[PDB]
Amino acid sequence: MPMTVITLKNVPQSLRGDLTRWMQEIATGVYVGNFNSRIREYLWRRVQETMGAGEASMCFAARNELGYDFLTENASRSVIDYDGLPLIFIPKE
Amino acid sequence: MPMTVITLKNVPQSLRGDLTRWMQEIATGVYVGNFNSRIREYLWRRVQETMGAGEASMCFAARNELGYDFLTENASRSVIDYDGLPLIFIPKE
Amino acid sequence: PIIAGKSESSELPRVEDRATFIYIEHAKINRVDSAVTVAEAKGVVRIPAAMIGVLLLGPGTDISHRAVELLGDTGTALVWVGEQGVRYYASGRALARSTRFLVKQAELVTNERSRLRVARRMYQMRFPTEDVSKLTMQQLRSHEGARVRRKYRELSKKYNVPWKKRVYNPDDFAGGDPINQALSAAHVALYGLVHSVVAALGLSPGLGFVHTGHDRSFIYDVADLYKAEITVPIAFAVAAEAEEGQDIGQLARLRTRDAFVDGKILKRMVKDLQTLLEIP
Amino acid sequence: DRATFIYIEHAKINRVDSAVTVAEAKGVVRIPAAMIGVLLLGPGTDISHRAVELLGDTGTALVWVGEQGVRYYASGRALARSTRFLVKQAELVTNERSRLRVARRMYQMRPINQALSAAHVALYGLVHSVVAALGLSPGLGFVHTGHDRSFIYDVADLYKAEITVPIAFAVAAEAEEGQDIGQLARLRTRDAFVDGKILKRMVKDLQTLLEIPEEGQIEAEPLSLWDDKEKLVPYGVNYSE
Amino acid sequence: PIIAGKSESSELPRVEDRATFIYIEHAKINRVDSAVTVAEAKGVVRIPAAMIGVLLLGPGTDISHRAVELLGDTGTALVWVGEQGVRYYASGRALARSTRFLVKQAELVTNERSRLRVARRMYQMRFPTEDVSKLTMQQLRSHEGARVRRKYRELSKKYNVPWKKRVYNPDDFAGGDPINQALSAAHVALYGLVHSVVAALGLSPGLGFVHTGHDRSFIYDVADLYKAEITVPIAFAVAAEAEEGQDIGQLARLRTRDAFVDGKILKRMVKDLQTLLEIP
Amino acid sequence: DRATFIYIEHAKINRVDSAVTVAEAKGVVRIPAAMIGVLLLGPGTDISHRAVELLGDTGTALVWVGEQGVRYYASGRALARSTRFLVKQAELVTNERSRLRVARRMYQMRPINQALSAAHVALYGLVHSVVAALGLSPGLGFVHTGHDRSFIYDVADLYKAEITVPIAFAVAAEAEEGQDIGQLARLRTRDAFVDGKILKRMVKDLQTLLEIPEEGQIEAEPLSLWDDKEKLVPYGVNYSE
DNA sequence: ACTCATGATGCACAAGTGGTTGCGCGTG
DNA sequence: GCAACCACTTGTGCATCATGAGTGATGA
């Protein structure tokens, strides 16, 4: 089962405790768990509608040269496609 | 290749930038990368001897029935095995 | 609308795709911020309940009510595996909204011919080297007990461990001998796993075939198939390996989880529950 | 032929030797374990391990419920881990003749939308609590089939038109604009469930449907620890404050 | 000890286990906090250098001395892929300590018979059906030239695009035709990848067999094997699929990367380099 | 037959029309592209894309070095894309006869430990920079083989007992407890290297070892921006401030 | 008696900002 | 000129505590 990582901050405590039912929490806001496509997709959909006004970022295995892809929802660090290679972009104030 | 996740805080900026060369950074202190076993062990050995006085937690795919394992060094959230199963233990004051 | 704490069956991993069991003792299971948190004295552990089929409760586990509500919603079954056997079971709503398995099991148990056929199939699974085309229920039970005791004797001479000519049963099986504790721990782990699988599949745990009388009869009927194949040899190996000062329960549970993973006991259990009920 | 239904809430149950201990804000209530029957552990309950050990040692059906059994959350083994109701129900539902007979027996026995929906859900919870206490399977239903709780639906159909409808109409009459109706409907339904006569009716109907002989039938006594202390003092229930 | 910014060859992935390339334009590659950072106007991007084999630098690109040192130590090669082909190359110390490959390549390039035989192997890998066991240098070179023209013509006819009878050559090849820009992008990516692999394996880019005279002769020789197999058809597909007002270079590079991944061009390249030197 | 080896440090390089624009703190310099033979880019340098394109169009070797070429970090193509040196080296190293002849020519022409090692490392860096500028392969070594940087060791052995040893001895003599000996050794080595005579001798020894005819040899010109302003002004190098 | 939501109050860590020191990474 | 180091401020959001509000997750 491909690995899935979700990072949260500035989100309601309900979601912060809810994700611990599916994946563990190695450190504050970051959650790691092994699922399949369906479970990971459903859990990302759940995170989408419970994060509210927060920041969420997901990392999971993909079919690129690096081997992973990112999904972010209103997150500070967006992802920019460098010709099929996903990289993290940090905008400057 | 298995996905390795390393989380850092209270570590020198040198390590924060250095570990980005191998494996990306999706959030403040949260890193994701795909390595084989040997590269991951070498990178963890690098993390151990560079963080100085700080917190380091690494999560990698393993062969237990959860699907992942944790190895941490001087981290707040220690890991306790629940009869061959890794769980995150958060000590109180 | 997604509400924290309530999830559909699809958002949850399938029965065969999750872990086996967790043993909790001297703790306080609780739900804070919609997370099943085990409030041990030293600190708190949050359980990834969606990845675990059954949760074992040892001595001193003060479990709240919303914790049980959350565990039942997740699909993680609860079993109070105290000293000397399993003391109590608990289960929420089934992970399956369809009762094809349940109605088929009811049809098979309401008919004497179907009951004897299912008992024959169970015996063939436990011992495939025999011919059971002309056996009866009482004969099947007697033979089952006879070669269960024979397997116990074989494993007792194999690992050089004393055994007081007994067969394990969850009712009143106690002793200071480490073999007793190892057998108890392995067997309660097996029974909790079987109970969780039966509850998740929608099957009624009281519609047993070999065992009748108590509402956990089907749990026994499914656990006895793998009792002598894995859990009993694992307990005997634990008793042989355990040294002075070793927690027999902890090591026995570790070894039985290792054997459950190695033997693929839970996927095998689902396949068996499908084959016995005869769904094409 | 007695089956007491002790409903607990807002308490912490621990075990003194052969006696559970319900410690509410009113005081500490000590009950002999041999008389528990069915325990409906409500919200805000911290049930201990020794307590469930003692309760399961005496065939006590522990059912985790909500406000007076509005919702069903989990259950343990049945009354004296009995299978007679379960086996009888399975035998009667499998073959067509007895299933049709039981369906005919059920038929013979038998804002506003939100109020009805909440009342139906509360009735489903109470019916599921009673069923899981007795030992029946919620899936083996006669009129309804194919679902995990088809039998729960079928049993609640008896009380659809005489419990949920009056409560829903009362809520609709008492409803205020800008207020959630399901909340009021659930609160009124649990208020109706407070007395316990409805639970007695459900137990009697469940035991009548399966053609259980009247001699072997057991009756329901929904005890209340503090409201019915006179009926409990001579039975061995110590009270403390 | 371990120093931030430095890493031994063992701590680095194998050459065939890395990503192919990344393109950077109108930016400022920089090293801050020991990380290869690409300081765009609107933000900053950190390059995972240890997983990328070669780095492509476009117009309006500033790179610092420490950034070049860091990329070279990491093993990533630097190629200045401006307009009109590759403008410059750059690389650091190789991550392959042993020089067996380089010594074998030198021995193979000093002997005229060895040069002719290795050129035969390259022509065979590029075109396996034909037999060239009795060809000389001029006969070979003219024959690959004719085959490349034929492949260009047939691929142009396949995708129905105008071709003005040209062949790619990084020696002053410029054009504003969208097909020309797409094929130039694919080819500069290919040459950068070849340079990265050759530098990583320890081979000298100046010891060529078919091409000779310039310091990158071996790079052209190795890229001959793969330029007509994948890069040209993918470039033609990009040109055919291009729409009005579209960045041809970005989509051409994306399709080139997709073709490299699908064709396993990196493991194939290292295997072909190993077989060319007859290393068992 | 003339090659100018201009070393750039603490400066930015950009192109305006055909001449690179050094933007050091002292002032702004406008060296034409054709004037530069090899650009030894040093620490604190932001080389631009336009400057790289212009330099590569005119066959300039960009070598990223340390302070005065003590360390070699990365390099581009050779001087005017020359392979004749590399081809001759490969031919002379392949067979045993030429290898032995060149090695014999090598020997014919050929705290304290910490300083010696640091000086050897700096000498290796300078040799590698010169070799990468000329186009030779560091692997193809005569005395040393089996390492990716063997030829660098062989060439540095020419100067091992003539340059590194006096510098290391001077550093050891002028040292105290608690001082980093490697730092002093590297600083003194770059102080020795700034003169440029060592680099000219190194290039000449490279061609001599390669058995290149004296007619075809190229003489090195270690030019400087402001130290040799009077020499650079007549060749079209503008100076600003 | 539980759990959640919420308004405080305290706080630990990352972020930018201002000079300062050094050009570094050290076997054949 | 580039980049690391360090010191100093600014500030974001996690974690805690005391109080009031609920018993909730809503289908023939």
PDB file of C-alpha atoms in Angstrom, chain B residues 63-66 68 77 80-85 87-92, chain C residues 19-23 38 42-46 48 51 250 253-254 257 261:
ATOM      1  CA  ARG B  63       7.018  -5.024   7.247  1.00  0.00           C
ATOM      2  CA  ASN B  64       4.565  -4.898  10.141  1.00  0.00           C
ATOM      3  CA  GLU B  65       0.800  -5.130   9.800  1.00  0.00           C
ATOM      4  CA  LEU B  66       0.326  -1.357   9.986  1.00  0.00           C
ATOM      5  CA  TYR B  68       5.147   1.705   8.538  1.00  0.00           C
ATOM      6  CA  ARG B  77       6.545  12.080  20.789  1.00  0.00           C
ATOM      7  CA  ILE B  80       5.997   2.593  21.927  1.00  0.00           C
ATOM      8  CA  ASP B  81       5.429  -0.848  20.421  1.00  0.00           C
ATOM      9  CA  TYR B  82       2.007  -2.311  21.236  1.00  0.00           C
ATOM     10  CA  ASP B  83       2.961  -5.987  20.906  1.00  0.00           C
ATOM     11  CA  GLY B  84       4.814  -5.652  17.619  1.00  0.00           C
ATOM     12  CA  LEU B  85       2.771  -2.654  16.453  1.00  0.00           C
ATOM     13  CA  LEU B  87       2.074   3.601  18.156  1.00  0.00           C
ATOM     14  CA  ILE B  88       2.870   7.235  18.944  1.00  0.00           C
ATOM     15  CA  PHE B  89       3.164   8.031  22.658  1.00  0.00           C
ATOM     16  CA  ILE B  90       2.840  11.661  23.757  1.00  0.00           C
ATOM     17  CA  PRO B  91       4.165  12.110  27.315  1.00  0.00           C
ATOM     18  CA  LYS B  92       2.521  14.632  29.619  1.00  0.00           C
TER      19      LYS B  92
ATOM     20  CA  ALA C  19      -4.200  -4.788  11.395  1.00  0.00           C
ATOM     21  CA  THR C  20      -5.085  -7.549  13.859  1.00  0.00           C
ATOM     22  CA  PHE C  21      -5.382  -6.373  17.475  1.00  0.00           C
ATOM     23  CA  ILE C  22      -4.086  -4.068  20.201  1.00  0.00           C
ATOM     24  CA  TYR C  23      -3.847  -5.040  23.871  1.00  0.00           C
ATOM     25  CA  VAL C  38      -5.515   5.709  25.721  1.00  0.00           C
ATOM     26  CA  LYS C  42       2.826   8.303  31.821  1.00  0.00           C
ATOM     27  CA  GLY C  43       1.131   9.717  28.734  1.00  0.00           C
ATOM     28  CA  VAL C  44      -1.540   9.461  26.064  1.00  0.00           C
ATOM     29  CA  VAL C  45      -1.607   7.215  22.988  1.00  0.00           C
ATOM     30  CA  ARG C  46      -4.071   7.836  20.159  1.00  0.00           C
ATOM     31  CA  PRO C  48      -5.447   4.484  14.545  1.00  0.00           C
ATOM     32  CA  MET C  51      -6.582   0.310  10.737  1.00  0.00           C
ATOM     33  CA  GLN C 250       3.171  -9.811  26.103  1.00  0.00           C
ATOM     34  CA  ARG C 253       0.723 -11.762  21.988  1.00  0.00           C
ATOM     35  CA  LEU C 254       3.763 -10.629  19.996  1.00  0.00           C
ATOM     36  CA  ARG C 257       0.569 -11.388  15.957  1.00  0.00           C
ATOM     37  CA  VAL C 261       0.780 -11.796   9.813  1.00  0.00           C
TER      38      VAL C 261
END
